Amino acid sequence: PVSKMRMATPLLMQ
Amino acid sequence: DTRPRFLWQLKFECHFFNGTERVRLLERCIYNQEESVRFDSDVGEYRAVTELGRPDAEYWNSQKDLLEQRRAAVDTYCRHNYGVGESFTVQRRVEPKVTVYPSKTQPLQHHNLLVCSVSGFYPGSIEVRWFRNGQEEKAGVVSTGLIQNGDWTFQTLVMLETVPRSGEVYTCQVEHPSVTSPLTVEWRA
Amino acid sequence: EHVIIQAEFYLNPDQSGEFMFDFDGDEIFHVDMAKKETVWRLEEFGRFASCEAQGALANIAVDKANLEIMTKRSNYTPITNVPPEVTVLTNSPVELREPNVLICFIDKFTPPVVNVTWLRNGKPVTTGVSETVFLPREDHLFRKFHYLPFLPSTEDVYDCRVEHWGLDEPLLKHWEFD
Structure with a gap:
């Protein structure tokens, strides 16, 4: 998004 | 309320060296106060920091689709976000206010601490040197160290052990990225 | 880096x-x-x-x-309760009757829950003040900042009162002009 911060996504546990 | 507490922290760390030339993504998972599992972009897959985190490293590593996206994050996540906030973070420059003063009023020929106060500056990287009559004094320098104010400014008090005598001129010299030439402030005993 | x-x-x-x-x-x-x-x-x-x-x-x-x-x-x-280390400082050298800010540093604690109160002459100060959320530490404990703008005086004393499960009792960190 060039001027938008991207959020990393947490993995779900089994 | 006497219930036990249980804490979970997730930290995605984008580390940058020499611009964005070298980037390292370090995704860390912490239960209570102990890291259990992590993805390190230098390794390329999840690793169990403790045995408690092994089932997760195994479960997640089995999904090569997720690993690829993690391996790419160094670009799509870290390098992208770096560029987003670069102008107001990496390039933030706030010039320090510098003052010199005796720690307290002392009798003539009494020992004292000369305080070089350096406040309101950013980034944290700084150098403070003391001079007595133009000659650098490296001994008897005590400091508070680098203090982060929590509001994107730092401060520090650098103090010089001395016995101020009439005629003496003390100089505090400060080097900081916000200025191309050192800041100097004199104090006359 | x-x-x-x-x-x-x-x-x-x-x-x-x-x-x-x-x-x-x-x-x-x-x-x-x-x-x-x-x-x-x-x-x-x-x-x-x-x-x-x-x-x-x-x-x-x-x-x-x-x-x-x-x-x-x-x-x-x-989780093991780890009580905070508390420090109170000004953000600049203190000048009599010269606008300044008191910073209550609350550091090296977990879990991330605390009760913080500014006190002037033993009285709660609930206006003009601000605070940060909980900030991460590398040892995975937390940091937090509370702020109080004020005017230096030889008549006022200040405390940051901090409560945390790691502490047996409220902790007061004192500040006053020499």
Whole structure:
């Protein structure tokens, strides 16, 4: 998004 | 309320060296106060920091689709976000206010601490040197160290052990990225 | 080296969550979970960048689920309370009758829950003050800042009163003009 911060996504546990 | 507490922290760390030339993504998972599992972009897959985190490293590593996206994050996540906030973070420059003063009023020929106060500056990287009559004094320098104010400014008090005598001129010299030439402030005993 | 950290937590049974970005130790922003909005640390940041807050809530929902799974896996090993180290400083050399700010540094503690109060001459000061959210530490404990603008005087004394489960009793950290 060039001027938008991207959020990393947490993995779900089994 | 006497219930036990249980804490979970997730930290995605984008580390940058020499611009964005070298980037390292370090995704860390912490239960209570102990890291259990992590993805390190230098390794390329999840690793169990403790045995408690092994089932997760195994479960997640089995999904090569997720690993690829993690391996790419160094670009799509870290390098992208770096560029987003670069102008107001990496390039933030706030010039320090510098003052010199005796720690307290002392009798003539009494020992004292000369305080070089350096406040309101950013980034944290700084150098403070003391001079007595133009000659650098490296001994008897005590400091508070680098203090982060929590509001994107730092401060520090650098103090010089001395016995101020009439005629003496003390100089505090400060080097900081916000200025191309050192800041100097004199104090006359 | 520079470091950007997306730090998230969930705490039970309080059901407290937090989502923040950290740059070399300073908060860039956090997301207000209740109001679902992005709160930039310095106003100018928000003019130069944006971030959709809705993503944060989804993350925290995943963190909450993972927490419960982990809690069970550890056989309900609870967190050890670590009491905070507290420091009170001005943000600049103090000049009599010259506007200044008292900073209450609350550091090296966990879990991330504390009760903080500014006291002037033993009386709660609930206006003009501000605070940060909980900031991450490398040892995985937390930091927090409380702020009180004031006018230096030889008549006033100040305390930051801090309460935390790691402490046997309220902790007062004192400041006053020489």
